Design brief:
Spike protein S2 (chain B), 16 helices, 3 chains, part of a larger assembly, Jelly Rolls, binds 2-acetamido-2-deoxy-beta-D-glucopyranose, alpha+beta
Chain lengths: 1002, 216, 49
């Protein structure tokens, strides 16, 4: 049987308290929402394994348990742990007492310590050598199934065990179901309140809803896609296509050899057309030193080599470090040179008993004199006499004439420091030449159209193997792409050409609605067939979870290639080709004109981040906080600290500069009159309220209410405080509402708000008479729009979306800087005083090199993130400075820049490290539907409107402006005479009223 | 250059492709590659945002009327061709023709594929052919193209009367001017300089990343 | 790209989606309108002047 385990199987990890924060822990936990076993207790207590620990859950009415047992025979013959709590004499010992088959309660020792209706939970874990006890009891009132709720078990006697026990037994109630589960290293996201009791937790690797919670570290999700993980279909098996040759290689010719060359004439034996196993070389204990930095000793069998040369010679036991890249010595410079880029492995077994004889092994010879250094792997057989002096040497040794090729003497009577030692360079150069010495591994059959772990001639990887039509030449082995990664291979068994394209992979994105809306999920496997995976396949790939619909809606949560989901009809997530709007065909003609009779003065809230936190991260107190030696090593880098501190102080003074450039653009400070009579325009939402403790707006109070360390990093306070930015915002807002635009230009010129809005209508091409006829209606419309944006900013989180997110990238910018106090960068620990109190000065200098280089990788990229993000802030801040300039200090005649629609003005309200504008705009609402003509002819003359458009309902010809239907008869104060009517096309015959004509006739 | 190939590298795949040891040693650097992945996905999303701000400023679907009685201004070279299998312009076809991986770094497909980027461009062209400036601000108001040129003439302070007086002449000059665009855009490779250089620039950036896979 | 793309957005807004009075902002000469054209990762404007 199985039953639902909602939130059980959980324990506390440590004794540490966390407050109002979300933290992720991995440990041996029990997965959530999992079907766990339900058992009965009538007429049943089997033995369960304990290899991973247990989560125990019991329902009890008389506490029927008398001992947790851990041993082999459990009958006082051996060591077995015992637990008995008889309410005053708690005992936890491991000696030999005789227990029954089923211990029960009715209502060599190693430690000693004294401490339905009921639910009791117990957990036992085994790390690091002590003795734990977990215990937690809670009352329940339920008999059918598991109650819903989260109780977190806290170890009372917390002392981590570490005993290896893989077997335990349960003690069931027999005067009742119990839960038992298997434990796995799975990570959850456990929620701490301010108070110390864990209230909720998410197994974040359960469904895509929880996979959002892994990366968002929260319990509520926003409607959107999230990069959760990297899906890559796992290759099913392992494939190897080594060449067919299987003969045993004469490694006895180079190891079991009767004759070894010397360093002057060392044998360079190409080893090819054989099988190199190396396994007998591992099993041989004959080698004493097995040195190489190129290849590894032990993990070499899976590799197949280009061509291996066995350089056989003899040199002294102290000379074994001379065979190394970059080593300089007598024999190293006169007999055998190793390149710095030497690949291959030199082997030196002991030759205590082989290359020696009683009289002296006198056949090993070496050069001691040369006037030049040696090339790598050269063959110098020079037999000339070296010239020591200036005298010519006619083959006559003696003074100034010695011969370089010197010999050795090897005897078993000689000392072990002079005893012959064997060193052999099995030079494993992995070069271009074809692979011929592969490992002793059996081959497998070939697979196509399915990605598989391939190991072709030593090159490992995953990918698909299809036949190729390229004519690889004989001795042509691989096809490399631009990355020199193997793109094509020739199969060494069958002469065919095989492309390598690495296997299908991509990120895991999630389509989900909000957790307040639904729990139905959608997981994405992108840019693939639905083969390595209600399935929808597009150019973006396979979308698993949402229903494909042919009907197209507005796009809400995009997943790729313009296929996106939405949660409608019962309701479910539906994926479709995105509609690019409402399908609005326009009845175009050469005489079709559309003119709005009606508008709405909508106010669009565009929110621009204009400042930030004036951070000043001094390098000494950040990287080398409370340390003298770290600062002494940091000043060895010279000018990085002074230039980055100059950069940060430049950031701070430039944030003050741009907040001055966006607010203190006026030389003179204005204050509102005590009477807020502004012609019907309710400014009490935007003007500061004297009843508030800070002289700030009600809209700003919303901006401050819901719309919102000490590790060497600080914030500098702005020069313009919260109250000061408030008083600039009120000053420039008063300057607008009492002076129009002139206060930003020169002396402040008084204008009433009706006059101001009249001319700001005039500035976009709508005549101010519409305002002065409908001032009451537009007062109602603007005030109701203020109330609407009041509701929007008080009810929608995205009203602070594009500012709060900037506050966020600042927040996790500084927070990841703090994470570099916890991320290690190659050191042993990231805690500075832990390093300085433990780690020695020499490698302490190179790990401070790592912390300076990497802490300034994170930090200099945090600072270039400050400077590129501040190119964003400065672009938006010069943008906002111009928005202040020709929207607050002026009026923007430039369209769709200072708000959606025709911009009229904007209201600066202060915001935390930013500014918000209320771009008051003119948006038409509905139009009546008219015919037109390019010009009109009255007396043979062509007429054109100076301002506005000739319009017609089909019976009468009117002229109206482009953006309001204001029906006026055609007037010579709105039109003129230019040209004649026979050349213009589309002109129609009409009559022109003149503002001169009835005055002349009457 | 408005947008870029949404390149996105993986902490696992690009830096330490298919290696548990190297992925562990990169998580040894902590969140360091995670803000890099965050930054590159941010570049992807803001590139989408650039494309959205330049194209999906439009709130509706505008389509061209079946008749191109545009007052003498033939747009069949700049407007999508119904005879073409993909509804794109002819000059866009020569912008697609004359001017035009699996190894740890991928390219994310755009949220807007090429055909429906062309659909947004067709929408913007349609709005500025039959509706002009009005659909940018508010409701779609149908206005003739002759009116748009005549009122646009007023903007620069020349009177619109000259336009209707020489409508046929300027139709000839503007159509032949678009033809000169067609000829130059089809003949000189230098005419695509500011996009060819930037697509190449991204290509050399990716290619240098590729060349670091040879660098030791 | 984003500076030139906000430039392109204002360009499209003020030069496609409206008429710009900014002299020498929409190519050389007195700007009339502009025609968007899609291109591989770019926009080609046909600024009539
Ligand atoms: C559309 C139009 O121009 N209609 C008539 C035109 O045919 C006529 O020659 C002229 C003489 O008054 O009156 C007008
Ligand atoms: C749910 O319980 C049933 C009972 O047989 C079992 O078959 C199934 O595997 C369980 N589901 C999960 C996800 O464990
Ligand atoms: C109760 O426990 C104590 C030790 O904890 C033990 O010595 C005693 O025998 C127990 N009592 C019974 C009745 O088993
Ligand atoms: C938190 O602890 C306080 C005591 O500090 C207590 O009054 C309260 O009930 C606890 N729980 C909650 C949910 O506040
Ligand atoms: C080389 O000598 C060792 C020494 O015992 C021996 O074990 C090994 O098998 C020999 N190699 C041959 C015979 O190939
Ligand atoms: C090769 O020959 C040249 C001239 O004969 C000589 O200088 C050089 O040392 C020689 N190198 C070797 C490795 O023999
Ligand atoms: C060598 O490889 C080819 C590949 O098909 C095969 O025909 C032949 O049997 C192989 N040699 C041996 C001894 O199996
Ligand atoms: C997807 O699979 C089908 C058949 O399995 C194949 O024809 C097609 O080319 C594949 N496409 C991709 C992009 O893998
Ligand atoms: C405008 O008037 C024409 C003429 O009757 C009509 O066909 C059309 O549907 C009307 N409405 C629109 C939006 O064009
Ligand atoms: C114009 O629009 C407003 C709001 O959209 C509406 O209340 C009003 O009745 C409309 N008509 C007139 C004549 O104002
Ligand atoms: C302005 O709005 C407030 C909102 O509380 C309202 O009480 C007041 O009557 C409105 N009008 C004036 C002139 O203050
Ligand atoms: C407008 O175009 C229609 C056809 O689309 C045509 O019948 C009509 O005569 C044209 N009118 C003018 C004034 O060009
Ligand atoms: C379309 O443009 C071409 C230019 O190649 C021109 O020859 C043709 O007359 C135009 N058609 C119309 C209907 O304007």
């Amino acid at each position: 049987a199985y039953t639902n385990s909602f939130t059980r199987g959980v324990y506390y990890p440590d004794k540490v308290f966390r407050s109002s924060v979300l933290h992720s822990t991995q440990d041996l936990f029990l997965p959530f929402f999992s079907n766990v076993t339900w058992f009965h207790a009538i007429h049943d207590n089997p033995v369960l394994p304990f290899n991973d620990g247990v989560y125990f859950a019991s329902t009890e009415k008389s506490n029927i348990i008398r001992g947790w047992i851990f041993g082999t025979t459990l009958d006082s013959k051996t060591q077995s742990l015992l637990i008995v709590n008889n309410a005053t004499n708690v005992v936890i010992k491991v000696c030999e007492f005789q227990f029954c088959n089923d211990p029960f309660l009715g209502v060599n020792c190693t430690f000693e310590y004294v401490s339905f209706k009921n639910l009791r939970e117990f957990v036992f874990k085994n790390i690091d050598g002590y003795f734990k006890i977990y215990s937690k009891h809670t009352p329940i009132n339920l008999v059918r199934d598991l109650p819903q709720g989260f109780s977190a078990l806290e170890p009372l006697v917390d002392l981590p065990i570490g005993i290896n026990i893989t077997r335990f037994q349960t003690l069931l109630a027999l005067h009742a179901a119990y839960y038992v589960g298997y434990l796995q290293p799975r990570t959850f996201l456990l929620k701490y309140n301010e108070n110390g009791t864990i209230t909720d937790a998410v197994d974040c690797a359960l469904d895509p809803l929880s996979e959002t919670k892994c990366t968002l570290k929260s319990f509520t999700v926003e409607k959107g896609i999230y990069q959760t993980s990297n899906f890559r279909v796992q290759p099913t098996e392992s494939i190897v296509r080594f060449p067919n040759i299987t003969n045993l290689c004469p490694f006895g010719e180079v190891f079991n050899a009767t004759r070894f060359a010397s360093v002057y004439a060392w044998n360079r034996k190409r080893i090819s057309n054989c099988v190199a196993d190396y396994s007998v070389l591992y099993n041989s204990a004959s080698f004493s030193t097995f040195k190489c930095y190129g290849v590894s000793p032990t993990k070499l069998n899976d590799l197949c080599f280009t061509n291996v040369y066995a350089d056989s010679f003899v040199i002294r036991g102290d000379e074994v470090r001379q065979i190394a890249p970059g080593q300089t010595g007598k024999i190293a410079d006169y007999n055998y040179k190793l390149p710095d880029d030497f690949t291959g492995c030199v082997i030196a077994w002991n030759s205590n008993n082989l290359d020696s004889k009683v009289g002296g092994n006198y056949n090993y010879l070496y050069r001691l004199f040369r006037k030049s250094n040696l090339k790598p792997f050269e063959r110098d057989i020079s037999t000339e006499i070296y010239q020591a002096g200036s005298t010519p040497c006619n083959g006559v040794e003696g003074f100034n004439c010695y011969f370089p090729l010197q010999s050795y003497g090897f005897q078993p009577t000689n000392g072990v420091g002079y005893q012959p030692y064997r060193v052999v360079v099995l030079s494993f150069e992995l070069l271009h030449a074809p692979a011929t010495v592969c490992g002793p591994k059996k081959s497998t059959n070939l697979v196509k159209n399915k990605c598989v772990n391939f190991n072709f001639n030593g090159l490992t990887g995953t990918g698909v193997l299809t036949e190729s039509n390229k004519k690889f030449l004989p001795f042509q082995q691989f096809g490399r792409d631009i990355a020199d990664t193997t793109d094509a291979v020739r199969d060494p068994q069958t002469l065919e050409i095989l492309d390598i394209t690495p296997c299908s992979f991509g990120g895991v994105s999630v389509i989900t609605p909000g957790t307040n809306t639904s729990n139905q999920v959608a997981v994405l496997y992108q840019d693939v067939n639905c083969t390595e995976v209600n399935v929808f396949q597009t150019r973006a790939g396979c979308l698993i979870g949402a229903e494909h619909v042919n009907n197209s809606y507005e796009c809400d949560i995009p997943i790729g290639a313009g296929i996106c989901a939405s949660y409608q009809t019962s309701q479910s997530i539906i994926a479709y080709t995105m509609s690019l709007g409402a399908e609005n065909s326009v009845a175009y003609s050469n005489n079709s004109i559309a003119i709005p009779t009606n508008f709405t003065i909508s106010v669009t809230t565009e929110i621009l981040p204009v400042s930030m936190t004036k951070t000043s991260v001094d390098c000494t107190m950040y990287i080398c906080g409370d340390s003298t030696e770290c600062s002494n090593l940091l000043l060895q880098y010279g000018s990085f600290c002074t230039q980055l501190n100059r950069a940060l102080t430049g950031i701070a003074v430039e944030q003050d500069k741009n907040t001055q450039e966006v607010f203190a653009q006026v030389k003179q400070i204005y204050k509102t009159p005590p009477i807020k009579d502004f012609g019907g325009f309710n400014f009490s939402q935007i003007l500061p309220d004297p009843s508030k403790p800070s002289k700030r707006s009600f809209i700003e109070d919303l901006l401050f209410n819901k719309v919102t360390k000490f590790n060497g990093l600080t914030v500098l306070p702005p020069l313009l405080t919260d109250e000061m930015i408030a008083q600039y915002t009120s000053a420039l807002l008063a300057g607008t509402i009492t002076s129009g635009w002139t206060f930003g230009a020169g002396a402040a010129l008084q204008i009433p708000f009706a006059m101001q809005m009249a001319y700001r209508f005039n500035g976009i091409g709508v005549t101010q008479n519409v305002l002065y006829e409908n001032q009451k209606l537009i007062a109602n419309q603007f005030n109701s729009a203020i109330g609407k944006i009041q509701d929007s900013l008080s009810s929608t989180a995205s009203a602070l979306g594009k500012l709060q997110d900037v506050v966020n990238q600042n927040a996790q910018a500084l927070n990841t800087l703090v994470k570099q106090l916890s991320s290690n960068f190659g050191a042993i620990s990231s805690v500075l005083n832990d390093i300085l109190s433990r780690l020695d000065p020499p490698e302490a200098e190179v790990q401070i090199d790592r912390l300076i280089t990497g802490r300034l990788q994170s930090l200099q990229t945090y600072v270039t993130q400050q400077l590129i993000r501040a190119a964003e802030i400065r672009a938006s801040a010069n943008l906002a400075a111009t928005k202040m300039s020709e929207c607050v200090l002026g009026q923007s005649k430039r369209v769709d820049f200072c708000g959606k629609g025709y911009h009229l003005m904007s209201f600066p309200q202060s915001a935390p490290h930013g500014v918000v504008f209320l771009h008051v705009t003119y948006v038409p609402a509905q139009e009546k539907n008219f015919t037109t003509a390019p010009a009109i002819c009255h007396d043979g003359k062509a007429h054109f409107p100076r301002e506005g458009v000739f319009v017609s309902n089909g019976t009468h010809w009117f002229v109206t402006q482009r953006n309001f239907y204001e029906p006026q008869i055609i007037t010579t104060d709105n039109t003129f005479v230019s040209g004649n009517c026979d050349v213009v096309i589309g002109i129609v015959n009409n009559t022109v009223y003149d503002p001169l004509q009835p005055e002349l006739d009457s």
